[PDB]
Short mmCIF file of N, CA and C in Angstrom, two decimals:
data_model
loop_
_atom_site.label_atom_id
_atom_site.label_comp_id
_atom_site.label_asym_id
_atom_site.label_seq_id
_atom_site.Cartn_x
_atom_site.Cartn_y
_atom_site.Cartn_z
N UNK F 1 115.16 17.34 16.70
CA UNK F 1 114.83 15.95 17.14
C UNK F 1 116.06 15.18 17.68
N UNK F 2 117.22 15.03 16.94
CA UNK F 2 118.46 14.28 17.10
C UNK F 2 118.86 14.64 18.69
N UNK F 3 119.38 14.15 19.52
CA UNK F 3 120.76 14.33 20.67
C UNK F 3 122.03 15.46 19.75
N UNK F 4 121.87 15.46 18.89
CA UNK F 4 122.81 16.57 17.64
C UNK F 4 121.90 17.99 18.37
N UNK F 5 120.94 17.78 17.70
CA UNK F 5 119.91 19.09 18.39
C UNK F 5 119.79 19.60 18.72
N UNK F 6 119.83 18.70 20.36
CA UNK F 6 119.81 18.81 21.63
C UNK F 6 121.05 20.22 21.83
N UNK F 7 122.11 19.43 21.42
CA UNK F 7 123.47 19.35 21.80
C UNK F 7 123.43 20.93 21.23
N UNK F 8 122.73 21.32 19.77
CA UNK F 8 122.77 22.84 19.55
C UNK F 8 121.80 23.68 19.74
N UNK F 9 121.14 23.22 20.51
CA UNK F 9 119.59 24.06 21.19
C UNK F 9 120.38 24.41 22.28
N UNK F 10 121.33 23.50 23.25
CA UNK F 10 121.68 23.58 24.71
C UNK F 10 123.33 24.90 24.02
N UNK F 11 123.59 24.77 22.81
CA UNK F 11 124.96 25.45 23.08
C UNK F 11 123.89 27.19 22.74
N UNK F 12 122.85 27.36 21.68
CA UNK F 12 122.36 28.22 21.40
C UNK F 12 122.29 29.03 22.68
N UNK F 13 121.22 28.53 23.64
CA UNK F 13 120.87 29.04 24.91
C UNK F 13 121.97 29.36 26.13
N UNK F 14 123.17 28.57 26.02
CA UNK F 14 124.08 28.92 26.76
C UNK F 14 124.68 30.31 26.54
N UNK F 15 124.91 30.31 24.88
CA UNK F 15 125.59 31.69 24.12
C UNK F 15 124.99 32.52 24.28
N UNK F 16 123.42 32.89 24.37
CA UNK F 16 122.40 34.42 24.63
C UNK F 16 122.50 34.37 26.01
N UNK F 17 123.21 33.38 27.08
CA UNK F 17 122.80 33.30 28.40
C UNK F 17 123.99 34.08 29.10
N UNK F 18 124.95 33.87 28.74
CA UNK F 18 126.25 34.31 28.62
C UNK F 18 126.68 35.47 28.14
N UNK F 19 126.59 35.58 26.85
CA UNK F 19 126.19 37.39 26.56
C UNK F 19 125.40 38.29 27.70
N UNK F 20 124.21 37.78 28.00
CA UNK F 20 123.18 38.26 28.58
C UNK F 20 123.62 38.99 30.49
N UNK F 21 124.52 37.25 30.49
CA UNK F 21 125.05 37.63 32.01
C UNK F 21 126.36 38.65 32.39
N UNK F 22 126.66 37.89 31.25
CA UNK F 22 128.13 38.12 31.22
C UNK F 22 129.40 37.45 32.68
N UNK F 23 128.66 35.94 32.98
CA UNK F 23 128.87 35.52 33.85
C UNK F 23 130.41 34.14 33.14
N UNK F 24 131.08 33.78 34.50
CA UNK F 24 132.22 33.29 34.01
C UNK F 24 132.08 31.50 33.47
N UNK F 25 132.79 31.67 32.02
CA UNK F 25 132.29 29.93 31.85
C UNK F 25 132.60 29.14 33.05
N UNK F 26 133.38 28.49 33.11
CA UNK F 26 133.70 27.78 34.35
C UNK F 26 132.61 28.05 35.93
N UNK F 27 132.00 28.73 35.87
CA UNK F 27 131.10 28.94 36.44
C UNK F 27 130.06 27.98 36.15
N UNK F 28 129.49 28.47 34.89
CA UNK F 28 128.71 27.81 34.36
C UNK F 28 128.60 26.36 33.83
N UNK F 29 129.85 25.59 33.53
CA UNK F 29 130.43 24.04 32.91
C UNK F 29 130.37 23.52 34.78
N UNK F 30 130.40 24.28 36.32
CA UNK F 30 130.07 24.10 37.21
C UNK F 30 128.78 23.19 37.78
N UNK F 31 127.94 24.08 37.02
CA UNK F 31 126.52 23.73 37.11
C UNK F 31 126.27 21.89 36.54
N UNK F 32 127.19 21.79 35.79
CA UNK F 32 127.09 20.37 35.35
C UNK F 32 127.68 19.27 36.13
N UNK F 33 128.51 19.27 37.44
CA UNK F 33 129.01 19.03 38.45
C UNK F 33 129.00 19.07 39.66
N UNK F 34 127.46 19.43 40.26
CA UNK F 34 127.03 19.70 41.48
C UNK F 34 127.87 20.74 41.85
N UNK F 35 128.24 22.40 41.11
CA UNK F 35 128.95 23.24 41.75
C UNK F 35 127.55 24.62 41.50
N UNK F 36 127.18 24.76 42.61
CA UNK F 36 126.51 25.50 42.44
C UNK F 36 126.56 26.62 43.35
N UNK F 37 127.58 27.22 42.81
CA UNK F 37 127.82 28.63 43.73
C UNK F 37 127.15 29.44 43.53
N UNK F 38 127.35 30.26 45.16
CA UNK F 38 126.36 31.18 45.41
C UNK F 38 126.89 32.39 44.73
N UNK F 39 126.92 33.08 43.43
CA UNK F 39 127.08 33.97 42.63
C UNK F 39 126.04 34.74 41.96
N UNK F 40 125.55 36.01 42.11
CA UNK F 40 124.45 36.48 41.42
C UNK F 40 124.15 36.28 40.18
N UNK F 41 125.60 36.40 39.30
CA UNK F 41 125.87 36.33 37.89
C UNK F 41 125.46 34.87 37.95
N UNK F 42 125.88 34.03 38.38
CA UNK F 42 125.88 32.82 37.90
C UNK F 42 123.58 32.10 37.96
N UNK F 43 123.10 32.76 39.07
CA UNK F 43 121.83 32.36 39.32
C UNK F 43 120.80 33.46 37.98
N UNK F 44 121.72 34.31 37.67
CA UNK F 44 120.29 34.99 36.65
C UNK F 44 121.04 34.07 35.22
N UNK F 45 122.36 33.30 35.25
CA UNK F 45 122.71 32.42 33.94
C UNK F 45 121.41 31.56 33.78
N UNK F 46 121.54 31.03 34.74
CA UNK F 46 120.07 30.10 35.16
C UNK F 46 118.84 30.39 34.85
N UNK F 47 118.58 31.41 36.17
CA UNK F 47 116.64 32.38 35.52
C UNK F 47 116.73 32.71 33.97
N UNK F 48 117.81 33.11 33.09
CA UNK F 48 117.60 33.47 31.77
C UNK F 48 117.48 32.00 30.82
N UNK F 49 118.02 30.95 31.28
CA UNK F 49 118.09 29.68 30.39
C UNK F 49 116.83 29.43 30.66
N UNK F 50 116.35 29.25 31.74
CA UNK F 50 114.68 28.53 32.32
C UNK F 50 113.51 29.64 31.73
N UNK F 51 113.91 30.81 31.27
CA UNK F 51 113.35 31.53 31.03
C UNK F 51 113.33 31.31 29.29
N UNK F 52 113.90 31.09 29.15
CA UNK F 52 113.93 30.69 27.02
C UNK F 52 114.02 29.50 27.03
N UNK F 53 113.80 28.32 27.98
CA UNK F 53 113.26 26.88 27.81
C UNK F 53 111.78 27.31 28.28
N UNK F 54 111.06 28.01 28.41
CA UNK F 54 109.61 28.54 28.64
C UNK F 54 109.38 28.11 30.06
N UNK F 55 110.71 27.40 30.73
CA UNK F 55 110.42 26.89 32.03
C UNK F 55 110.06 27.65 33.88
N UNK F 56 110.32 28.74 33.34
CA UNK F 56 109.71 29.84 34.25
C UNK F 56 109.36 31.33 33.76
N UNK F 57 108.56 31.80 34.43
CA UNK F 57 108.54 32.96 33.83
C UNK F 57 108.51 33.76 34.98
N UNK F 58 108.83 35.15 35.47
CA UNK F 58 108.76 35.90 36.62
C UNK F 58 109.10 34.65 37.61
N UNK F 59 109.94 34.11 37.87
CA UNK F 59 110.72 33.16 38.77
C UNK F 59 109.08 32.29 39.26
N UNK F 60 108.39 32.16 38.21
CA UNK F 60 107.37 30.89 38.96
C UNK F 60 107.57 29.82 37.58
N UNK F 61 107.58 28.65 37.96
CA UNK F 61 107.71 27.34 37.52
C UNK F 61 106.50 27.30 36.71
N UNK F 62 106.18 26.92 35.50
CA UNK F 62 105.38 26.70 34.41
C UNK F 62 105.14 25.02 33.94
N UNK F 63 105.02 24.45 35.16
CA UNK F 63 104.98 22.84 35.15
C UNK F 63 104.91 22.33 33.45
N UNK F 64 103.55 22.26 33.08
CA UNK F 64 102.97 22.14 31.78
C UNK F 64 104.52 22.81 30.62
N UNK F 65 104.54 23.78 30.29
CA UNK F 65 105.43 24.74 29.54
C UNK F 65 106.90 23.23 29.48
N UNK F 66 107.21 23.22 30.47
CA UNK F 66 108.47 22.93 31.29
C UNK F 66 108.69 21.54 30.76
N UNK F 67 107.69 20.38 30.62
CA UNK F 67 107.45 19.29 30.44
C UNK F 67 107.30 19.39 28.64
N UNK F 68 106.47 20.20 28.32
CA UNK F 68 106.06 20.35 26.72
C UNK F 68 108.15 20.46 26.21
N UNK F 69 108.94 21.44 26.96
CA UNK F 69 109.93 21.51 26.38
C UNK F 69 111.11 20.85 26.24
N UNK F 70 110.89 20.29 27.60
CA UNK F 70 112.11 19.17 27.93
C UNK F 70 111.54 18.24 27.04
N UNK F 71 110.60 17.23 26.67
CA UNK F 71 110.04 16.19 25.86
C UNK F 71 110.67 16.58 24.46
N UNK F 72 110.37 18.01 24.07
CA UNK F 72 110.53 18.33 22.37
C UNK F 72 112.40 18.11 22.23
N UNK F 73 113.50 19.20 23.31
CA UNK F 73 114.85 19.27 23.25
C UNK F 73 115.06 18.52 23.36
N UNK F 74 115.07 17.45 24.40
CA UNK F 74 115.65 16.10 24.82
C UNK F 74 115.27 14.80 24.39
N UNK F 75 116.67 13.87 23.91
CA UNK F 75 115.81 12.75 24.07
C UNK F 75 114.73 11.84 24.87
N UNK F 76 114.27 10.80 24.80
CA UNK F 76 113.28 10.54 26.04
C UNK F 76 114.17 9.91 26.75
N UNK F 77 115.45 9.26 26.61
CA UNK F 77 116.10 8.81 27.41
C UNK F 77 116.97 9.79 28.56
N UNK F 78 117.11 10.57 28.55
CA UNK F 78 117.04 12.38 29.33
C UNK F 78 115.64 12.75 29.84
N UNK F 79 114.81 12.71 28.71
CA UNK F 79 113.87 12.97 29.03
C UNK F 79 112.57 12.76 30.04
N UNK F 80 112.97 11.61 29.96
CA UNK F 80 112.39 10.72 31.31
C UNK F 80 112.66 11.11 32.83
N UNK F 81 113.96 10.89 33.12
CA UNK F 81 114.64 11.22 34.07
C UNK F 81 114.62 12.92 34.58
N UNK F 82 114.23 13.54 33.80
CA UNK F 82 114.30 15.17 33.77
C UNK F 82 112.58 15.41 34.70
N UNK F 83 112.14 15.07 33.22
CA UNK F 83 110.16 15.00 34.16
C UNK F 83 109.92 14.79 35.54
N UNK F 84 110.63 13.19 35.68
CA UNK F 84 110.68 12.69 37.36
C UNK F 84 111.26 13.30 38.60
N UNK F 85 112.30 14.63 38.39
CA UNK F 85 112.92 15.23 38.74
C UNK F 85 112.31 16.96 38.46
N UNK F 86 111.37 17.02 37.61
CA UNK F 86 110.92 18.18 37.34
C UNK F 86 109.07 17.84 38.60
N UNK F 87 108.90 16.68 38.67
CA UNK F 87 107.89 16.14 39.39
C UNK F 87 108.44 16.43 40.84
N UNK F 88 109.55 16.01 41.28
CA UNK F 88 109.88 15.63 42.53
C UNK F 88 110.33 17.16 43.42
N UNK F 89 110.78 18.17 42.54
CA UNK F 89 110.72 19.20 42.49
C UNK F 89 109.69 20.37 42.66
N UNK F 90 108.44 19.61 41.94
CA UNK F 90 107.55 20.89 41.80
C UNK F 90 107.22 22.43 42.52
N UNK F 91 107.35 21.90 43.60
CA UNK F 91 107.10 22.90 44.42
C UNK F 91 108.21 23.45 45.13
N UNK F 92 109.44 23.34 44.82
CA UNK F 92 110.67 23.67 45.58
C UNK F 92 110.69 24.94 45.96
N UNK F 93 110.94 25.83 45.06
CA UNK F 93 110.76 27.27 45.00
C UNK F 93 109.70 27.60 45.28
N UNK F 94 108.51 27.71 45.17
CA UNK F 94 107.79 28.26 45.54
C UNK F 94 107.63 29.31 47.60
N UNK F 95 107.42 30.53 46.88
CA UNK F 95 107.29 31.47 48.17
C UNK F 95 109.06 32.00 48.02
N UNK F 96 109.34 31.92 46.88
CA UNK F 96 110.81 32.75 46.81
C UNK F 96 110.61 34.06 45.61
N UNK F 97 111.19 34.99 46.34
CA UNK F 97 110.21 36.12 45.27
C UNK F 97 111.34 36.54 44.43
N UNK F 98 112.47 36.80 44.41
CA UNK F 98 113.38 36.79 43.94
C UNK F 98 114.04 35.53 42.74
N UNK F 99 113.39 35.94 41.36
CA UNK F 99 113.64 34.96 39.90
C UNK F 99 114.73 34.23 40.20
N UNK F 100 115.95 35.25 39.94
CA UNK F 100 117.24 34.41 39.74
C UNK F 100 117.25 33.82 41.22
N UNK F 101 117.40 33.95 42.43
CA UNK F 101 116.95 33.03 43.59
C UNK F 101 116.22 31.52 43.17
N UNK F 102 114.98 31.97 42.56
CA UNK F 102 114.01 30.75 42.70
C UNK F 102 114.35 29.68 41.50
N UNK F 103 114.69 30.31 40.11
CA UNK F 103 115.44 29.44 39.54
C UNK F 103 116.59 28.50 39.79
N UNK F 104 117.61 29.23 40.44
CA UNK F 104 118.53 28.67 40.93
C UNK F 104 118.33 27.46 42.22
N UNK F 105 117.75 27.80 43.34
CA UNK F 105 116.62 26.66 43.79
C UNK F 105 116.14 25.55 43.42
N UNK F 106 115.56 25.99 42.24
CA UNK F 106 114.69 24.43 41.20
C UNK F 106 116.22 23.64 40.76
N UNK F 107 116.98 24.34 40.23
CA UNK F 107 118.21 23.40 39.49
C UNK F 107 118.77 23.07 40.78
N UNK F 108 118.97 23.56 41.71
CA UNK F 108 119.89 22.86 42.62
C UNK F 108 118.83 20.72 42.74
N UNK F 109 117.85 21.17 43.09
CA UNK F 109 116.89 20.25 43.21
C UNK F 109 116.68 19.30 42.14
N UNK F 110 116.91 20.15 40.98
CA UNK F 110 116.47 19.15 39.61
C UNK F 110 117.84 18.45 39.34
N UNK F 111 118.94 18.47 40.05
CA UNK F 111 120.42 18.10 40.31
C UNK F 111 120.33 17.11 40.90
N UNK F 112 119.87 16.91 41.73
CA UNK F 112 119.76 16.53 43.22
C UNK F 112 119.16 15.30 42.95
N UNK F 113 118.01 15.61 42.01
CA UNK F 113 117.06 14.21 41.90
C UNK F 113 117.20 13.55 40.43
N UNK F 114 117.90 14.16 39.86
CA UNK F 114 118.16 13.07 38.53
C UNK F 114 119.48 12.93 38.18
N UNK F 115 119.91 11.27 38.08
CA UNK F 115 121.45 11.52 37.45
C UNK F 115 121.59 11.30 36.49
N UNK F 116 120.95 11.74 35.75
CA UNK F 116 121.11 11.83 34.48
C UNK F 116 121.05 13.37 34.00
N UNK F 117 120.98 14.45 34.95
CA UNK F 117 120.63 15.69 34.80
C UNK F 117 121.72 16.39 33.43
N UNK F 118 121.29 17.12 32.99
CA UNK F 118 122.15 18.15 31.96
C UNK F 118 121.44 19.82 32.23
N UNK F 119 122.40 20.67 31.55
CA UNK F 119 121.86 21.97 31.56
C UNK F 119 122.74 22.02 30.71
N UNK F 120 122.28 24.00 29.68
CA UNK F 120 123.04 24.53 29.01
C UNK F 120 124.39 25.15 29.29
#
């Protein structure tokens, strides 16, 4: 419930994301800075986080899923701003067949439209 929570739900998912990629931090502390390089490693960091926030699955967007999870991790004061940006988004990716591609897509976008944005 707490922003504490938050704060160890977002470090949990970073650590299996990271193992997983084996992609470079600074890469990734990137993503929190409008740096969104074009790196393979760095776009499946992404498809695997959106993928254990229930927020995509096979690189398609799970609107419903996506909204249920951001509401529960985040405060609503994040939380708000995330939805409106997960709204404004919806359809970004779509017709990209390639996961880590289409994930990476949505965050560039879900960047783009909220400043209040965070990731793991």
């Amino acid at each position: 419930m707490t922003v504490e929570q938050m704060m160890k739900s977002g470090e949990m998912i970073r650590s299996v994301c990271l193992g997983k990629t084996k992609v470079a931090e600074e890469l990734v502390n990137g993503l929190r800075e409008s740096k969104f390089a074009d790196v393979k490693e760095l776009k499946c960091y992404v498809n695997c986080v959106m993928e254990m926030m229930q927020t995509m699955k096979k690189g398609k967007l799970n609107y419903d899923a996506s909204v249920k999870q951001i509401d529960t991790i985040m405060p609503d004061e994040l939380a708000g701003p995330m939805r409106a940006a997960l709204d404004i988004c919806r359809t970004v990716a779509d017709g990209i067949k390639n996961n880590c591609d289409a994930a990476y897509v949505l965050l560039q976008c879900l960047s783009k439209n909220n400043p209040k944005f965070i990731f793991p």
